[PDB]
Design a protein around this ligand. Sequence first.
Ligand SMILES: *[C@@H]1O[C@H](CO)[C@@H](O[C@@H]2O[C@H](CO)[C@@H](O[C@@H]3O[C@H](CO)[C@@H](O)[C@H](O)[C@@H]3O)[C@H](O)[C@H]2NC(C)=O)[C@H](O)[C@H]1NC(C)=O
Ligand SMILES: *[C@@H]1O[C@H](CO)[C@@H](O[C@@H]2O[C@H](CO)[C@@H](O)[C@H](O)[C@H]2NC(C)=O)[C@H](O)[C@H]1NC(C)=O
Lengths: 60, 217
Amino acid sequence: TTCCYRFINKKIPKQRLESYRRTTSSHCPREAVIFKTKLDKEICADPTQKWVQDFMKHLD
Amino acid sequence: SEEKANFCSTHNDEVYARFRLQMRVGVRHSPLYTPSNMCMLDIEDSVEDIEESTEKEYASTATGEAAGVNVSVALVGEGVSIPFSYIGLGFNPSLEDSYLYVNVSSRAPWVKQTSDLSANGGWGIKQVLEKELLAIQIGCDNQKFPEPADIDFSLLVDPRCVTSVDLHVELRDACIDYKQESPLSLKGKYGDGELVKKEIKDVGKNHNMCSLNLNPG
Ligand SMILES: *[C@@H]1O[C@H](CO)[C@@H](O[C@@H]2O[C@H](CO)[C@@H](O[C@@H]3O[C@H](CO)[C@@H](O)[C@H](O)[C@@H]3O)[C@H](O)[C@H]2NC(C)=O)[C@H](O)[C@H]1NC(C)=O
Ligand SMILES: *[C@@H]1O[C@H](CO)[C@@H](O[C@@H]2O[C@H](CO)[C@@H](O)[C@H](O)[C@H]2NC(C)=O)[C@H](O)[C@H]1NC(C)=O
């Protein structure tokens, strides 16, 4: 499992996205959400940014 | 330069992007990893579509794998292409814990003209400053383990094989050397950037070197 050392300060395009995933604590110090894409690229916003929590609600 | 100069001269009043990455990755091999010199690198661009808009999403991705470790670098413009023209690794084929250096660079407009991002009041610069996303990520290949000018990027790493990460990144006016300022001078860091900038510039004493340069024109 992968781990984020940095975060995007912008918000990612709604249209372009696809899947979602959430980290493994013991592994990754910072808990965060990983967003895949139509492009098959895994951007990752460090949450607390509601923009994320909403997007994930759109996912779910 | 011979050309770059003549060019920047003959092109005073507009701005072309140059994007530049430098990155030292600390590596840790799997106990079952076998030493190897193999290196695979690749660049791939793509032009997907912002449904809502009339404006295409452009994207350039560089990738390279060596020493059990694979890297992927993804730059995504809304309405602007910054084509990666080149990637280079410096890497160490042993089992030893070691460093892996990753260069990535855009095209020189004076090799092949990128867009003048300044046209129409700096429309492009709007597009970049606001829209451009950058996504770096690092993994372990197929090796198996025993169980505001602040550039806006995301780094995800598989920590099993990755010990450390340091990088300096920039997206800047491709002629800022011959200009006082520019409206495109974005920069980014993570850990000792200015250091890895110094160091990358000469690891070719103590590593294998592979790299890919795309055809000019
Ligand atoms: C990433 O990009 C940098 C910048 O282009 C590369 O820097 C180049 O590194 C090589 C060797 O690693 C340098 O060659 C050396 O030049 C010195 C000058 O004193 C010479 O005495 C040595 O015998 C050697 O030829 C070269 O100077 C340098 N280029 C520039 C413009 O500084 C670096 O190699 C890249 N890293 C990679 C692919 O891992
Ligand atoms: C490093 O390489 C691994 C192995 O190729 C990549 O993992 C693949 O991810 C895809 C998802 O599209 C999965 O189907 C498989 O788990 C993997 N491919 C296989 C086993 O052939 C991973 O994408 C790479 N990471 C980076 C940053 O390049």
